Design a protein around this nucleic acid. Sequence first.
RNA 1: CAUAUUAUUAUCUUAUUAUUUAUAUAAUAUUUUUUAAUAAAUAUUAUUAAUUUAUAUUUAUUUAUAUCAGAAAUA
RNA 2: CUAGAGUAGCGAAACGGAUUCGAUACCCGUGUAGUUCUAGUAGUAAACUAUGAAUACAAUUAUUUAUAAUAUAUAUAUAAAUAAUAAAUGAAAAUGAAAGUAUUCCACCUGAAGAGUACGUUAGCAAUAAUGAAACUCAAAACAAUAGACGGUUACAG
RNA 3: UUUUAUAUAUAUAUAAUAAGGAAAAGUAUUUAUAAGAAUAUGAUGUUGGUUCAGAUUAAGCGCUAAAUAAGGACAUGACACAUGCGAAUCAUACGUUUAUUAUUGAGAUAAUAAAUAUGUGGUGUAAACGUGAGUAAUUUUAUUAGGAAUUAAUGAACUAUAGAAUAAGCUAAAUACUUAAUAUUAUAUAAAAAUAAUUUAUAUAAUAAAAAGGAUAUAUAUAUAUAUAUUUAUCUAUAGUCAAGCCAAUAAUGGUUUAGGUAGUAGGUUUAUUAAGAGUUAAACCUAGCCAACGAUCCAUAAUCGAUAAUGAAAGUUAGAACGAUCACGUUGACUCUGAAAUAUAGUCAAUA
Lengths: 52, 57
Amino acid sequence: GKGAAKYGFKSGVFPTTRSILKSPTTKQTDIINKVKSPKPKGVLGIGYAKGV
Amino acid sequence: EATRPLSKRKFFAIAEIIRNKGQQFALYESEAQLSVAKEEAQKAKEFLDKRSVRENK
RNA sequence: CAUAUUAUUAUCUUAUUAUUUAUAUAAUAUUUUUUAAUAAAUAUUAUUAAUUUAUAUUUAUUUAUAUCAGAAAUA
RNA sequence: CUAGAGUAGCGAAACGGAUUCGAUACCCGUGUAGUUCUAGUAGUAAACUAUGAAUACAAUUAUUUAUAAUAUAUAUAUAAAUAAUAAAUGAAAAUGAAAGUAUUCCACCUGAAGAGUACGUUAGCAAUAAUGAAACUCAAAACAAUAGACGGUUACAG
RNA sequence: UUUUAUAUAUAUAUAAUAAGGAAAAGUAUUUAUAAGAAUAUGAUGUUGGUUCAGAUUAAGCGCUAAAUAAGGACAUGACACAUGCGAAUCAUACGUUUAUUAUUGAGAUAAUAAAUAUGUGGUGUAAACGUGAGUAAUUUUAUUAGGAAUUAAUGAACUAUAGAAUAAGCUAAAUACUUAAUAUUAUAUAAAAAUAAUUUAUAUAAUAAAAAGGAUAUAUAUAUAUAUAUUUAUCUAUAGUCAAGCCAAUAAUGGUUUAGGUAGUAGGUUUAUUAAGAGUUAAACCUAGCCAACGAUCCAUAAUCGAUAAUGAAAGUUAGAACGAUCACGUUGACUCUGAAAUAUAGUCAAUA
Ligand SMILES: [Mg+2]
Ligand SMILES: [Mg+2]
Ligand SMILES: [Mg+2]
Ligand SMILES: [Mg+2]
Ligand SMILES: [Mg+2]
Ligand SMILES: [Mg+2]
Ligand SMILES: [Mg+2]
Ligand SMILES: [Mg+2]
Ligand SMILES: [Mg+2]
Ligand SMILES: [Mg+2]
Ligand SMILES: [Mg+2]
Ligand SMILES: [Mg+2]
Ligand SMILES: [Mg+2]
Ligand SMILES: [Mg+2]
Ligand SMILES: [Mg+2]
Ligand SMILES: [Mg+2]
Ligand SMILES: [Mg+2]
Ligand SMILES: [Mg+2]
Ligand SMILES: [Mg+2]
Ligand SMILES: [Mg+2]
Ligand SMILES: [Mg+2]
Ligand SMILES: [Mg+2]
Ligand SMILES: [Mg+2]
Ligand SMILES: [Mg+2]
Ligand SMILES: [Mg+2]
Ligand SMILES: [Mg+2]
Ligand SMILES: [Mg+2]
Ligand SMILES: [Mg+2]
Ligand SMILES: [Mg+2]
Ligand SMILES: [Mg+2]
Ligand SMILES: [Mg+2]
Ligand SMILES: [Mg+2]
Ligand SMILES: [Mg+2]
Ligand SMILES: [Mg+2]
Ligand SMILES: [Mg+2]
Ligand SMILES: [Mg+2]
């Protein structure tokens, strides 16, 4: 009963709604640009360095 | 950084070295040894020379 | 001192199974060398069943490894 | 306690003398270990300020104590020790530059008894030291202070 | 103050001088909400425990009890089970059996009716249901806008599209089984960049892996075949949907009076196996490592959780019955076939009854 306060006081659960499109579409320019953008270099980034 | 399982307990791999302090700590060690040897030799030569001067007196 | 149950093992025994060895006048398929029984025509010539032969798929047999579970020892 | 040496006094234990209803005690005598030195073991005390360490701040007075001056005199200034306090804090006693106002870290406590006991483990030559419960019983248990009673409690008077 | 004067050696001592005065009327939502009491004491204050006032239950019991409506109902022995049911269905897969009519002469074949699921076959029982023994994590639970090895020429079973559905054998016959025919990856060339690799296109290599017919009608011809059409089936390919396999991070009870533990142990290099990484398993060769007083290893206990239940002002605490999610199990242990996925409530072996 307590935890329901987080979820709008609704008791019970619905199954998680499924996404019709599992992967992003090619018309989403922003997602492609973020994907294609140069990866941040170094440790605050996400990728292996040039020499390593 | 996350990686495929490479062993029972290893699941990460290094990607880059922001700070090379550990690398420098050995280069400086060897350089210090080499420089200390020659500086020792020079100062020992000076001390021997001074001993010779006081022997002459 | 006595009873009990899990766990293990440089020990003993081992169902079944998994690989792994070696053997089969062992089979079955097909490939030969051949023997009988049979079919059409003017000595046959081929056919099916059995003989020998060497490639597969297994069966019996045993070599090793592991292995349920049981004892023996320990905790 | 373990080895050596030492051993004048003192003195566990022991042996006797007194006292006592009884003396196993206080008093008295002889007095062993020990106290002493060297080389070790051990790591416990009411090992106490019953008050861990560090930092910033916090109103006075009085002494000293230690420096720095200025000419014994400036009842000279700067520090710390000590004593009494203000505020503050505290159950109060009381603390008083910490028991105050704050910050940081560590150790410790969760009713009395059972109990620092049992069992186990670690270390020591050993005595022992460290760590350390549980069941059961109970509504108790303790601290400060108040007013009494009491003391083989003091002094003053009559 | 500031500036300047005189005097004295840029500076020093004395004296004078000072710019800061502006005025005016009118122009709620406040939030969340924590109460103590009795018992010490000769009496007082404080520490301190004990008990009580509230709510609730998977409840039990004593006394009592009218009806209706709804929600629950072996928490303990995962102890043993008499008895009846809980998984069948298809006659349009193949076979059988009858009865009538017709032609053919004990039967034969058609048409029409039926029976036949004690014969051969297809589909369904990996689900649902119940349970909580094991499990403190070596594969379990929760969570992430987490990943890759950058997961298979996997469809399980529906949708959308295209194709194909051939021959023999053995079954008594087949949509039963075998044999056969036919229908992504690895290389090479370039391209780019989301690049120190991946992707894209091409060209080859092999992909190369299948199938099945029934029920009706008709149309041909010569009962036999055949050819269509309608229905229901079969196989392959692409995509979708639903799904699976593996790993990462954080959290998950008590006892160190369990202080050392670990030798596949920690890591490296290869090989076998998988769709797939890895001492996961099997083999080989190297290094000496790995965890641990922020608690290893060992032991005991326990299914886990929620937008579930109880309680509290709340943080939290307890439960895990009921509703829901995950896991594990179907008397116990191991292994094997099938399969995409099972150590299956299957099979084999053993243990118990
Ligand atoms: Mg590796
Ligand atoms: Mg001595
Ligand atoms: Mg003496
Ligand atoms: Mg004496
Ligand atoms: Mg006495
Ligand atoms: Mg005496
Ligand atoms: Mg001594
Ligand atoms: Mg010492
Ligand atoms: Mg002591
Ligand atoms: Mg002490
Ligand atoms: Mg103390
Ligand atoms: Mg106090
Ligand atoms: Mg002791
Ligand atoms: Mg009372
Ligand atoms: Mg109550
Ligand atoms: Mg009911
Ligand atoms: Mg039950
Ligand atoms: Mg239950
Ligand atoms: Mg039929
Ligand atoms: Mg049948
Ligand atoms: Mg199931
Ligand atoms: Mg269920
Ligand atoms: Mg046929
Ligand atoms: Mg078939
Ligand atoms: Mg490997
Ligand atoms: Mg391992
Ligand atoms: Mg090995
Ligand atoms: Mg532990
Ligand atoms: Mg359990
Ligand atoms: Mg359980
Ligand atoms: Mg439930
Ligand atoms: Mg629980
Ligand atoms: Mg139930
Ligand atoms: Mg099972
Ligand atoms: Mg089982
Ligand atoms: Mg049963």
